RNA sequence: GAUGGGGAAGCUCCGUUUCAAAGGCCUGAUUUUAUGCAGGCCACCAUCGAAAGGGAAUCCGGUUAAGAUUCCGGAACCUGG
RNA sequence: UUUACUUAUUCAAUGAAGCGGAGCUGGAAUUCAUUUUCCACGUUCUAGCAUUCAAGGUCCCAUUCGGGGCUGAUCCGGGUU
């Protein structure tokens, strides 16, 4: 369990060194197509605690979800219903980013 | 310590080693006997007035044939079945969906004869 | 409210340039290594009216550097070309009618014309028929040129966009009156369907906002703001003055 | 000298076509080679911190090699003879009765990424060896610290596919001597001078050190064309 | 109008030559050689879309209760091999 | 309030061919101890023509049909620009 010291490292987000290595990966990620597969795992000590064992089985898929917020679709931002639904830029879909990825 | 050499402008993906099958079990249990035979090929002569005199004089045989096939099949089957040496076989799908197929002999053989040997006049 | 002419022009259905008869790019050719060291010669094979473009065009051939081929290119043709003329492009071309030269190695007054806003966009400015850029001096540090469009307005613009030498061809068309509305209506059928235009004072205030009443008459000032959306702005755009003009303009 | 004549082609940029030169420089390589390649050099560009830059400071292909030596004769078992000491436990049990002392006491490396940091914690480990690499560079990083903590000795050897090919899988990273057979013994110690004096003891000077921020061959020329020749010439 | 891709909770949307490692080509080896191998090559890049546009080649005479530039007689032509 | 670096970001190009640094070499050129520099560094009377790892020169196989290497086409960094 040498994981216990790298889960405390990056814990320690803010901290230089792993924000430099953050600008790289970033970098990194948006180069590869949106979604893929990870040929292993970047963190393994989270991947372990959420139950992954490194064996044959076992696959890991990198991918990203674009950010913010769900406008609604309705067509030249109408919506005929009463005023309390004419909401177009700020609603926020109940699911998170994390879901749909 | 060195590199490769190369000149044209662009890669592309390398000829690999296209690998046939062989795969550890057959598809289906047996190839499948023949669909379409001799006799699953012709059907039927026909014999309406208008086949008659088209026999008795053109030496050409009339036949229903099944619709999967086509001249080919009926100038085999033809030669496998009743011993013949065909000509052109000219063939239409009839308004009730069956294939006619007017099949003309070599002038060799008489069709009025191969007529009364398989049975129908 | 229904979507007035202006909005659906963009939509694309109907409105799309009409391209069957067009000849193809009117394109400088790559800016490549022979151009940008040197120079390079070419012959022009044929000069041809291409139609939704008043200034004729002008295929011209050259000699691919690096495989034994003919590659053509089709710029717009400057007055005073003729078929089987050469033509030299270049850095080291000659200040011949004709020849696409780069603005740095030009003098000023120098007359080009297709000149390009950038370094090898193939064509950009002055491609109208009978129209012309005018260098106007150098900016030798930071290598820009400060160019006369023919709008009037100035520009900057780096001296290794080439442009080519000369005016362009078919000068004064509009000199003459197109007449009758059958001519305009060959003329417009051969760009795209923005004609004939009914005016909005006419259709009913459904169909747009001068619309309706009594009398054809337009009733709100006609002048739009900048910042009006789409479909407020049908009249004239955010004008900073209307009314006939007097007196010499160009007005510095 | 025969009738064969001589006719040199002219390759001065209008005339005669330019024939096949070596355009290795220009070729458009894969997206994956593209991503590789700038993805190193984009390292090298930013400003790195000094936690990172402590590796790429390496230890060099002659002290190495002795290391290589060193470590490459405590190589552990393979299927033979892991099978042979089954064999041997087999015999022995039966007969000799002796409850696991048929065999000796291995002296091949003690290796694991988790039990190297284990050893580590209790100062059971008297050598330890470190790959540059490893992507995921999260795992290796904190060891230096560590080994400089619990006054242990930590080489940034090269390769943790060498590393690897000792200890018999394909890759490690992290191999550590903490027993050894009391015969190579000096050359132990020599080692023990030798990497303190490399990497250990200037472990605070790296603590202040800042890599990276290393312009491009053209970038570089740029800064000199430009930024030197303003006083100088 | 697919695929590459990029959007969108998604039904699906754009885009169709595009930030792709997108493919096949003729020749030699031969008497281990089946098609691999020592080579050269070439870059565009799916697919559907008009029984009025483009399009390889057929005409005469006769014949049936109803068929024919299609059957019988006679005379041709093109294509691939 | 300026203005600099560039690796992120952005826009553009094109079968991502000739980038930057450094040279031979020839001109301008001051030379002050032989440089300090700066320009060039293969084509403009003609609607032709330019391709077959290029001829040529050269060293090794073997010269028995021939074959490979260097250069011709100066180098280093391989940042496509």
């Given at each position: 369990g040498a994981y216990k010291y790298l889960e405390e490292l990056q814990r320690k987000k803010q901290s230089d060194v792993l924000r430099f290595l953050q600008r790289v990966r970033v970098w990194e990620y948006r180069q590869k197509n949106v979604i893929h597969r990870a040929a292993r795992p970047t963190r393994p000590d989270k991947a372990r605690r959420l139950g992954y064992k490194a064996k044959q089985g076992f696959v890991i898929y990198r991918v990203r979800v674009r950010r913010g917020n769900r406008k609604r679709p309705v067509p030249k931002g109408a919506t005929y219903g009463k005023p309390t639904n004419q909401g177009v830029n700020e609603l926020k879909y109940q699911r998170s980013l994390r879901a749909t990825a | 310590?060195?590199?490769?050499?190369?000149?044209?402008?662009?890669?592309?993906?390398?000829?690999?080693?296209?690998?046939?099958?062989?795969?550890?079990?057959?598809?289906?249990?047996?190839?499948?006997?023949?669909?379409?035979?001799?006799?699953?090929?012709?059907?039927?002569?026909?014999?309406?007035?208008?086949?008659?005199?088209?026999?008795?004089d053109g030496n050409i045989l009339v036949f229903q044939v099944s619709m999967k096939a086509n001249k080919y099949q009926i100038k085999k089957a033809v030669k496998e079945l009743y011993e013949?040496?065909?000509?052109?076989?000219?063939?239409?799908?009839?308004?009730?969906?069956?294939?006619?197929?007017?099949?003309?002999?070599?002038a060799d053989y008489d069709a009025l004869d191969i007529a009364n040997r398989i049975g129908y006049i | 409210?229904?979507?007035?002419?202006?909005?659906?022009?963009?939509?694309?259905?109907?409105?799309?340039?009409?391209?069957?008869?067009?000849?193809?790019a009117a394109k400088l050719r790559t800016l490549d290594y022979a151009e940008r060291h040197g120079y390079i010669r070419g012959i022009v094979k044929q000069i041809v009216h291409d139609s939704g473009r008043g200034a004729p065009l002008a295929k011209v051939v050259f000699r691919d550097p690096y495989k034994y081929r003919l590659r053509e290119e089709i710029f717009i043709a400057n007055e005073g070309v003729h078929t089987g003329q050469f033509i030299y492009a270049?850095?080291?071309?000659?200040?011949?009618?004709?020849?696409?030269?780069?603005?740095?190695?030009?003098?000023?007054?120098?007359?080009?014309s297709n000149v390009e806003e950038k370094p090898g966009d193939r064509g950009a400015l002055a491609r109208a028929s009978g129209n012309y850029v005018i260098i106007i001096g150098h900016?030798?540090?930071?290598?820009?040129?400060?160019?006369?469009?023919?709008?009037?307005?100035?520009?900057v613009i780096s001296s290794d966009a080439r442009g080519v030498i000369g005016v362009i061809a078919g000068g004064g068309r509009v000199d003459k009156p197109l007449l009758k509305a059958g001519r305009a209506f060959h003329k417009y059928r051969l760009k795209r369907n923005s004609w004939p235009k009914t005016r909005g004072v006419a259709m009913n205030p459904v169909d747009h906002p001068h619309g309706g009443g009594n009398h054809q008459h337009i009733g709100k000032a006609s002048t739009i703001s900048r910042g009006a959306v789409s479909g407020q702005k049908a009249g004239l755009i955010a004008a900073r003055r209307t009314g006939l003009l007097r007196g010499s303009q160009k007005t510095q | 000298n025969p009738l064969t004549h001589s006719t040199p082609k002219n390759f001065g940029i209008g005339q005669a076509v330019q024939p096949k030169r070596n355009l290795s420089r220009y070729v458009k390589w894969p997206e994956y080679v593209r991503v590789q390649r700038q993805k190193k050099i984009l390292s090298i560009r930013l400003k790195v911190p000094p936690t990172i830059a402590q590796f790429q400071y390496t230890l060099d292909r002659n002290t190495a090699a002795e290391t290589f030596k060193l470590f490459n004769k405590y190589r552990p078992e393979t299927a033979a003879e892991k099978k042979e000491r089954l064999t041997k436990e087999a015999a022995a049990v039966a007969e000799g009765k002796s409850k696991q002392d048929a065999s000796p006491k291995p002296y091949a490396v003690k290796y694991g990424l988790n039990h190297v940091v284990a050893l580590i914690e209790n100062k059971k480990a008297k050598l330890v060896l470190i790959a540059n690499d490893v992507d995921p560079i999260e795992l290796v990083v904190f060891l230096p610290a560590l080994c400089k903590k619990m006054g242990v000795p930590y080489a940034i050897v090269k390769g943790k596919a060498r590393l690897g090919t000792l200890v018999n899988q394909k890759t490690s990273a992290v191999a550590a001597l903490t027993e050894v057979r009391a015969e190579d013994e000096a050359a132990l110690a020599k080692l023990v001078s030798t990497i303190d004096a490399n990497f250990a003891d200037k472990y605070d000077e790296v603590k202040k050190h800042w890599g990276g921020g290393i312009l491009g061959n053209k970038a570089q020329a740029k800064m000199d064309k430009r930024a030197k020749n303003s006083d100088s010439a």
């Amino acid at each position: 369990g040498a994981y216990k010291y790298l889960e405390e490292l990056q814990r320690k987000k803010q901290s230089d060194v792993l924000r430099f290595l953050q600008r790289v990966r970033v970098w990194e990620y948006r180069q590869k197509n949106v979604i893929h597969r990870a040929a292993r795992p970047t963190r393994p000590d989270k991947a372990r605690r959420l139950g992954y064992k490194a064996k044959q089985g076992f696959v890991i898929y990198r991918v990203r979800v674009r950010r913010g917020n769900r406008k609604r679709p309705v067509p030249k931002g109408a919506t005929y219903g009463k005023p309390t639904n004419q909401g177009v830029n700020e609603l926020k879909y109940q699911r998170s980013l994390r879901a749909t990825a | 310590k060195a590199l490769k050499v190369r000149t044209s402008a662009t890669f592309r993906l390398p000829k690999t080693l296209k690998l046939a099958r062989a795969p550890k079990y057959a598809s289906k249990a047996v190839p499948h006997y023949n669909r379409l035979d001799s006799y699953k090929v012709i059907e039927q002569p026909i014999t309406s007035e208008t086949a008659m005199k088209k026999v008795e004089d053109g030496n050409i045989l009339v036949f229903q044939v099944s619709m999967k096939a086509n001249k080919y099949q009926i100038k085999k089957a033809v030669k496998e079945l009743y011993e013949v040496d065909v000509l052109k076989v000219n063939t239409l799908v009839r308004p009730n969906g069956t294939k006619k197929a007017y099949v003309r002999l070599t002038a060799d053989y008489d069709a009025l004869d191969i007529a009364n040997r398989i049975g129908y006049i | 409210g229904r979507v007035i002419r202006n909005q659906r022009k963009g939509a694309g259905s109907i409105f799309t340039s009409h391209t069957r008869l067009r000849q193809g790019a009117a394109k400088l050719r790559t800016l490549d290594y022979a151009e940008r060291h040197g120079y390079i010669r070419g012959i022009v094979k044929q000069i041809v009216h291409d139609s939704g473009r008043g200034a004729p065009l002008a295929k011209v051939v050259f000699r691919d550097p690096y495989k034994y081929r003919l590659r053509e290119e089709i710029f717009i043709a400057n007055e005073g070309v003729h078929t089987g003329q050469f033509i030299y492009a270049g850095k080291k071309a000659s200040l011949n009618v004709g020849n696409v030269l780069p603005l740095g190695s030009v003098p000023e007054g120098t007359i080009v014309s297709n000149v390009e806003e950038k370094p090898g966009d193939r064509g950009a400015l002055a491609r109208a028929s009978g129209n012309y850029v005018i260098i106007i001096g150098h900016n030798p540090d930071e290598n820009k040129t400060r160019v006369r469009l023919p709008s009037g307005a100035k520009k900057v613009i780096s001296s290794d966009a080439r442009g080519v030498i000369g005016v362009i061809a078919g000068g004064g068309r509009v000199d003459k009156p197109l007449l009758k509305a059958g001519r305009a209506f060959h003329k417009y059928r051969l760009k795209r369907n923005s004609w004939p235009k009914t005016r909005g004072v006419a259709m009913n205030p459904v169909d747009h906002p001068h619309g309706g009443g009594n009398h054809q008459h337009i009733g709100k000032a006609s002048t739009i703001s900048r910042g009006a959306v789409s479909g407020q702005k049908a009249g004239l755009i955010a004008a900073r003055r209307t009314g006939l003009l007097r007196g010499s303009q160009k007005t510095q | 000298n025969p009738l064969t004549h001589s006719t040199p082609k002219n390759f001065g940029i209008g005339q005669a076509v330019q024939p096949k030169r070596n355009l290795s420089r220009y070729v458009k390589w894969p997206e994956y080679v593209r991503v590789q390649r700038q993805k190193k050099i984009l390292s090298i560009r930013l400003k790195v911190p000094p936690t990172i830059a402590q590796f790429q400071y390496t230890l060099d292909r002659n002290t190495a090699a002795e290391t290589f030596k060193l470590f490459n004769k405590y190589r552990p078992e393979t299927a033979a003879e892991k099978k042979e000491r089954l064999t041997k436990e087999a015999a022995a049990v039966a007969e000799g009765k002796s409850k696991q002392d048929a065999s000796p006491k291995p002296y091949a490396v003690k290796y694991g990424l988790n039990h190297v940091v284990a050893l580590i914690e209790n100062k059971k480990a008297k050598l330890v060896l470190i790959a540059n690499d490893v992507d995921p560079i999260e795992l290796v990083v904190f060891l230096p610290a560590l080994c400089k903590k619990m006054g242990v000795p930590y080489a940034i050897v090269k390769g943790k596919a060498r590393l690897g090919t000792l200890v018999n899988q394909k890759t490690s990273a992290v191999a550590a001597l903490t027993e050894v057979r009391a015969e190579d013994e000096a050359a132990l110690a020599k080692l023990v001078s030798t990497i303190d004096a490399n990497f250990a003891d200037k472990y605070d000077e790296v603590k202040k050190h800042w890599g990276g921020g290393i312009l491009g061959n053209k970038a570089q020329a740029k800064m000199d064309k430009r930024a030197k020749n303003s006083d100088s010439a």
